C-alpha cells in the first residue's frame, strides 16, 4: 500500500515537471521566426525592388524634361 | 482512502492526456518555424536598396530645388 | 491494488516517453531562427518602405508641376 502511494507520488512529481518543461518550450518556440514572417519580409523586399525600379525610371524622365 | 487515490490517478490520467496533446501541438508549431540560414542574400538586397534609395533622394532634392 | 498499480505504471511509461519527446523538441528548436535576430532586417525594410512612399509622392507632385 506504501508501494502504490510511492508510485502515485513519482507520477505526481514527473507530471508536474513535464508541465513546467512544456511551458518553457512554448515560450522558446514563440521567440522563433515563422516561415510566414520570412515570406512577408521577402515579399516586402520584392515590393521595394519593384517600386524603386519604377521610381528610377520616373526620376530619369523628370530629369531630362527639367533639363 | 482507495477512492481518494483513484480520484488522484483520474486527475493524473487527464493531465497526461493533455500533455500528449500539448506536445503534438508544439511539434506542429515547430514545423512552421524558419530554419536558421545565411542572411547574406536578403542583406545584400537590402544593401542594394539602401544605396539606390540614397541616390534617388539626392536626385529628387536637385529637381525639387530647380523646379522650385 | 493490482488494477490501480497497473494503471499507474502505464502512465509512468507515457510520461517517460513524453520526457524523451520534449528533450527531442528542444533540439529541433535550436535549429530555428530567432525572431530577435531578424529585427534589424525588418526595421530597415520598414524604413525603406516609408522613404519610398514619400519619394513617390514627391516625384508625382514634381511630375504634375512640370507636365
Residue numbers in the entry:
A (entry chain E), C (entry chain F): 1 to 67
B (entry chain D): 0 to 67
What are the paper's exact sentences on this?
α-Helical coiled coils are ubiquitous protein domains, found in a wide range of structural and functional contexts. The structure of coiled coils is understood at a level unrivaled by any other fold. They consist of at least two α-helices, wound into superhelical bundles and held together by a mostly hydrophobic core. The seven positions in a heptad are labeled a – g, where positions a and d are oriented towards the core of the bundle and are thus mostly hydrophobic. We find that they indeed break the α-helices to form short β-strands, which associate into a triangular supersecondary structure we name the β-layer. β-Layers are found, also repetitively, in natural coiled coils, where they form regular fibers with alternating α- and β-structure, a protein fold that has not been described so far.
